[PDB]
Design a protein around this ligand. Structure first.
Ligand SMILES: CNC(=O)c1ccccc1Sc1ccc2c(/C=C/c3ccccn3)n[nH]c2c1
Length: 296
C-alpha cells in the first residue's frame, strides 16, 4: 500500500539541471537505469557518479505510478550499507520522474563472478577467494535482515539484483522495469506474467504467496549462484510443469563447484519445503558470521 507513503521534497528533491545523464546501465521495455554525474547531491559542491532510474518511450502513466511507489518505499526503507541507497529524486512537473541511487562500480554480481572463474583461488592480487564469497553472502544476509526489519520483502532476490561496489561491498537492488524480462531467460512465462521461477519458493509458484521466508528460499538460490561463481541455477533442467512438481516433491540442486560443506547445508536449509522451517535472515546473519570467522 505504498501509495499512502510520504514524499518529502525538501529532503529528497534534486534539480534536473544538476544531473548529467550518461550511458545506460540497464534497459527494459518501459524503464532504464542510466549512469549520471550529479553535482552536490550528497556532499556540498562535489561531483558524484550516481545511478538513475527513469522511464523509456513506451511507458505509460501506470509505470510512472510504480516508479513513484518505488521511490516512496526506498524512503521508507532508509539506509544500510548493504542496500543501494537513495540519494534523491526529480519529481517536478515538466520533466520525467527520476530516482537517484548510489553507483556501484562493478555492476551486478552474477556477471561479475562469471568473469572471475580464471581469477579465483579458494585460499593472486585481485583474485577472488572463498573468503570473498562468504563475505558477499554475509553482507546480502545483513541487507535482507535490514529489509525485513522495515517490514518489506524483495520478491526478486537473485545475483542479478546484487551489485558490487568498491572495497568488496555488495548492495541489494532491484533493476525492476530497467530489466528486459521479455528477453531475459531468467524470467519464464507463467500466465499473464514473466516470473523468476528458478528463484521462487514452491508456495510462491503454486499459491502466489510472497513472504520474507520466500525471500529466504531465493537467498538459498543466490548462495548457489555465488558458490558456483555466477552459474545459471538448475543446469540442464527445463523450467516447466515437471520442474515445479519435482520441486514440491523435494528435488534440490546439487552442491556447486566452489561451496564448502556447511555453505551447501545452508542452501538446503533455505530450501526447506516449509517456510516456517527455513532460517530467518537474522539466523543466517549469525550463521554466516560464524562461518566467516571460521574461515579466518
Ligand atoms: C529498488 N530500486 C533500485 O534498486 C534502483 C533505484 C534507482 C536506480 C537504480 C536502481 S537498480 C541499480 C542498477 C544498476 C546500478 C549500478 C551500476 C551498474 C553497472 C556498473 C558497471 C557496469 C555495468 N553496470 N549502480 N547502481 C545501480 C542501481
Amino acid at each position: 500500500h505504498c501509495e499512502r507513503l510520504p514524499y518529502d521534497a525538501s529532503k529528497w528533491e534534486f534539480p534536473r539541471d544538476r544531473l548529467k545523464l550518461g550511458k545506460p546501465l540497464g534497459r527494459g521495455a518501459f524503464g532504464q537505469v542510466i549512469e549520471a554525474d550529479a553535482f552536490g547531491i550528497d556532499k556540498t559542491a562535489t561531483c558524484r557518479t550516481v545511478a538513475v532510474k527513469m522511464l523509456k518511450e513506451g511507458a505509460t502513466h501506470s509505470e510512472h505510478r510504480a516508479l513513484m511507489s518505488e521511490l516512496k518505499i526506498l524512503i521508507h526503507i532508509g539506509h544500510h550499507l548493504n542496500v543501494v541507497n537513495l540519494l534523491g529524486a526529480c519529481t517536478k512537473p515538466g520533466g520525467p520522474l527520476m530516482v537517484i541511487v548510489e553507483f556501484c562500480k562493478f555492476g551486478n554480481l552474477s556477471t561479475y563472478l562469471r568473469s572471475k572463474r580464471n581469477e579465483f583461488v579458494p585460499y593472486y592480487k585481485d583474485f577472488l577467494t572463498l573468503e570473498h564469497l562468504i563475505c558477499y553472502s554475509f553482507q546480502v544476509a545483513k541487507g535482507m535482515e535490514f529489509l525485513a526489519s522495515r517490514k518489506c520483502i524483495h520478491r526478486d532476490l537473485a545475483a542479478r539484483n546484487i551489485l558490487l561496489s568498491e572495497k568488496n561491498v555488495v548492495k541489494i537492488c532491484d533493476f525492476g522495469l530497467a530489466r528486459d524480462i521479455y528477453k531475459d531467460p531468467d524470467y519464464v512465462r507463467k500466465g499473464d506474467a514473466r516470473l523468476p521461477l528458478k528463484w521462487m519458493a514452491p508456495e510462491t509458484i503454486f499459491d502466489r504467496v510472497y513472504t520474507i521466508q520466500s525471500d529466504v528460499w531465493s537467498f538459498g538460490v543466490l548462495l548457489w549462484e555465488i558458490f558456483s561463481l555466477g552459474a545459471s541455477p538448475y543446469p540442464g533442467v527445463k523450467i516447466d510443469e515437471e520442474f515445479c512438481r519435482r520441486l514440491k516433491e523435494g528435488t534440490r540442486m546439487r552442491a556447486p563447484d566452489y561451496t564448502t560443506p556447511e555453505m551447501y547445508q545452508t542452501m538446503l536449509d533455505c530450501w526447506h519445503g516449509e517456510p516456517s522451517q527455513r532460517p530467518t535472515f537474522s539466523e543466517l546473519v549469525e550463521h554466516l558470521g560464524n562461518l566467516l570467522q571460521a574461515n579466518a
